[PDB]
Structure formats: C-alpha cells, structure tokens
Symmetry: C3
Subunit: 222 residues, 3 copies
C-alpha cells in the first residue's frame, strides 16, 4: 500500500495549476525583458509537474538496499530538481545583471550539487551515502555564499525598486533551500528517522513555497 499517494497526489495539482496560471497571465508590454522572464518561470513549475505526476504514478520508485533493509528512493526527485534549479538561479542573476562569471559558475556549482545528490541517493552501502551528502551540501553553500556577499551589486543606475523584490526572494532561497539537506539527511534515506509519508510532505511544502509561490513573489512585482 502506498500512503504517500496523497501528498504526492497534491503536488501535481499545485504545480500543474501554477503553470496553467503563468501563461494566461504571461505577456510582454514594452520591453521583451520580462519576456525572458515570464518564460523561465513557467518552465519551472511545468517541468516539475511531469515529475510530481511521475512520482505520483509509481514510476519513479526504486528499491535500493542499505545492508539491512530494502528501501524506497524516488529517483524522479533529483530529476525535477535537476532542471528547475538552474532556471531559478537564472531568474535571479538575470534580474540582478550578474556577470556570466558568477553565472556559468552559479549553475555548475548547482549542477554538481544535485548530481552527487543523486549518486549518494542510490548507493547500496549504508556508509558511502553521507560522504556524497557532504560534497553536495558543501557545494550548495558555495552558491548560497555568492548569493549574499556576492550578488550585492552596486545598486547605482538601477530601479531603486529591485532591492526589495530581490532580497525578498534572496531571503526565500536561503531559507527554503537550506532545508533539503536537513530532511534528505534523516528522511527515508538518511537516518530512517522520519519515514516517507511525512518526509514526502515536508518535501512538497518545500517545493511549492519554492516555485508556485516564488514566481508569484516576483512577476507581481516589477
């Protein structure tokens, strides 16, 4: 019996309707600037949608063995997180014209975080995961950093409005994101403390508040 069905039966709707919501509202008035934007942000919840639906249907659920059991690992998790994250980081650096340097970097720093996440997310040695967990977090903290001391531009010739619009998402990333290693850590694959049911939910409120909500928190603003 799969009782994660409901928390996973609810991330399709939310993410899915979130997309069906940005096109409708999506258009460009005088500067095909928001145009680049209005796009990205639709992609983020849309891509995810196939994933929540992909977990939801029972297709993204393997049964890897940690010397003592045979547990579930929704591999289709890192997949959705694989294409959304570099898209958000783009909504970011874009807004805050961020030298391509921190850009190519920004992403790769991302990429390598999820990938390794994946590796340590399927390994059959109860003691080889966690190490991979280090390198991943380790890396996370690198974008996170560059995101602070980093994207702190030289707000001089720009919209004396961005600031907030920026730091309000810049504060929603540092908080919302930093939660993943923490759950993944003790979830269904970390310590075996919190089992899937609750984790999986901990995971969707973490997602939505990160996408559906995110994009709004921005496109409503200039």
């Amino acid at each position: 019996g799969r009782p994660e069905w409901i928390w996973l039966a609810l991330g399709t709707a939310l993410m899915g309707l979130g997309t069906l919501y940005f096109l409708v509202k999506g258009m460009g008035v005088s500067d095909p600037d928001a145009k680049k934007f209005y796009a990205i942000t639709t992609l983020v919840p849309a891509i995810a949608f196939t994933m929540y639906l992909s977990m939801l249907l029972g297709y993204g659920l393997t049964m890897v063995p940690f010397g003592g059991e045979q547990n579930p690992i929704y591999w289709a998790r890192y997949a959705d997180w694989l294409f959304t994250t570099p898209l958000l980081l783009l909504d970011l650096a874009l807004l805050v014209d961020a030298d391509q340097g921190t850009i190519l970097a920004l992403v790769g720093a991302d990429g390598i975080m999820i990938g390794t996440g994946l590796v340590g997310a399927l390994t059959k040695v109860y003691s080889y995961r966690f190490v991979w967990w280090a390198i991943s977090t380790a890396a996370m903290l690198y974008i996170l950093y560059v995101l602070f001391f980093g994207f702190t531009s030289k707000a001089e010739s720009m919209r004396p409005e961005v600031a907030s619009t920026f730091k309000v998402l810049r504060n929603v990333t540092v908080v919302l994101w930093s939660a993943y290693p923490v759950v993944w850590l003790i979830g269904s694959e970390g310590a075996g403390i919190v089992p899937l049911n609750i984790e999986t939910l901990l995971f969707m409120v973490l997602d939505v508040s990160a996408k559906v909500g995110f994009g709004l928190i921005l496109l409503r603003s200039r």
Copy 2:
C-alpha cells in the same frame, strides 16, 4: 528474426550521407551568419546518424511488458529526437530573429514533449501510457502555435526574400511533425494496430523529409 532491419538499414545511409554532404558544401563567404547555420544543420543529420545506426545494430531495442504481451520499444528513438528538435527550432527562430523569450520557451516546450514521450514510451501499465501521450502532444501544440501567430514578425527592415524561405519550412514543420503522435499513437506501442515493420518505415520517411531534405530546403536558399 528482425525484419525492420531494412527500413532501419536505410536511415543510416540517408542521414549519414546527408551529413557528409553539408560539410563539403559548408563554408562562409561574407557574413559568419550562415556560419552559425551551416553548423546547426550538419549536426541534425549527423547526431541522428549514430541513432539510426544505434537502432540498426540492435542496441536500442528493449522488451517492455503491457499486461498481455512483451513488446519492442526502440528507446534509441527519443534520444535522436532529443537533440535534433531543439536544433531545428534554432535554425528557425534564428532565421526569424526570435526574441530569446519565445526561444528559451520554444525549446523547453520541446524538451518536455520528448521527455514525457519517453516516459509514456517505456511504462509497464497498458493504461498509463496514453495519459503521458496527452501531455506530450498537448505541449507540441504549444510550439506549433507560437510558430504561427507567433513567429509572424513585422517583416519590415528585412530580406523581402525570407518570407517564402520561412513559410516553406514553417509549412514543412507543421505538417511533417504533427504526424508523430499519430503513428506513435497506433504504432507498436499505441494500439498495436500497425506493427513495427510498417511503422518504422512510416517513421524514417518522416525523419528524412524532416532533416536531409529540410536543411537543403534552406541552405540552397539565401
């Protein structure tokens, strides 16, 4: 016995010789503009070539079960279509200087179409495929649309020649492309109406007339 061998033994040659044909002819005279082009278009048939060869050799053929049989699904199909499609859409939007907005969008709209194609292209529930088929088509129709009402620029300061060169491919995409969901639909994995042999052929005439021919239909023109 594999009698799809011949229709699949012929897509290597066509696609393969099609490549060996664009480099030879490929060069740039006054504007490294066609340069960006002459490139893309070589990639399209070349990438494909490894794929027709990859199917052709018997390496891209799985045996997924639809509660009642055990049928073949050339997974190496969505692979070739995974990198060619975003390349063509580029030959397009390029030619028709198309705001990066419709661009990043164009592709992702593509991407998600093939990916999901893949998912519903390997699933073991005779009733979970088709749904995925919806989301894929559903999406197709989104680029298709933006391709019409969409790429209809403001032909003002440009080559009063593009138009045709454009709408002739723009008419070759809307027709040739829209055939895939229709075959995949009843092919060897849809309904089990048309078996592989014929499908596979339906599939290669669909491909070539889409690449070998395509690129020509363009680079011959200015």
Copy 3:
C-alpha cells in the same frame, strides 16, 4: 580484489586539490573577462573530482560480456569526460575569439565523440564495439583539425602575447588528447592487451596533465 584502487585513489586527490586551488587564487581585477575564465577552469577539475571519487568507491564499475569473458568497464569515465571537454574547448575558442559557428560545431563534434565512445563502451558483441570506435575517433579528428588550420585567426589587433599562451595549450591538446583512442583501443575493452591496472594509470596521467596542469598552463599567463 581491486588493485586499480591506488591509481584511482590518486586521481581524487590531484583533481580535488587542483580545484581547491583555483578558487583560492580565483579573482577578477579590471576586466570580468578572466572572470568567465577563472570559472570554467575550476569546473573542469571539480566535476572530474566527483568522478574519480565515483570510480574510486566502486560505484562506476559494470560487468559487460564480450562473448568469451565478463569484463569491467568504468562507465563513470565517459561521464566526467562528457562535461569537461566542452568546457576546455571553451577556454580555447574563448581566448581565441572563435565565431560561434566553429563554436556550436566544436562542441557537438565533441559531444558525439564521447557519446558514441560510451555506446561502443558498453556493447555486448565483441565485434560491434570497434566500429563505434571509428565514428568516435573519426569525429575527434574533426575538432582537432579545426583546431589547427582552424583557430589560426588573423592575429592583428590583439595581445601579441596570446599566440604562445595559445599554441602551448593548442599543442598540449593535440598531443595529450590523441592518446585516448590509442589506450581505450587496447586497454581493458579494446584488445585485452594492457589490463586495467596499467591502463587506468595510463589514463590518470593523461587526465591530470590535461586539467590540473592545463588550467595552470593558462591562468598563470595573461
């Protein structure tokens, strides 16, 4: 027993410390030009690092059968080479402002080389590999070429210093790179001449002298 452990236990350190070395030294003084650079080059050894670590731990080792045995094929090899190569080619074409034409081309020409490498790197017919080996090399020789007669710009309005800095890496790529088909050829999957132990080492001196060293051979210079 795995005696490749040491040669693979040493590529983590080298590549790993090589990264920990470019950030530290990595910064931008007057032109966020080196900025684009200082980035790429950190990625190259870093990405690799997870891979040497991924081989090193025993996670990237399959057991494919060549009609007569059951041999090892560190599939996690083409993975690291999948993202580093298009990054180096970028350190290159960048430095030598290289029309996007040769650029998009440069990479795809790369991409298809490793991919096919992979295909012929896992196939279970002792006689179908080598063919794939052809198409791969075949392709290699295409970037290699464009790298010579090709990137030979029109050194006119530029740093009368690049030249060397260029041809010294341009000479380190043509030599160091061209060795892979040659080892892969007779290694543990080609002819079965040189077994893993030595190959694997032949392979890491080939790597480092290609990355750790590479990047240095450049960023030290202007």
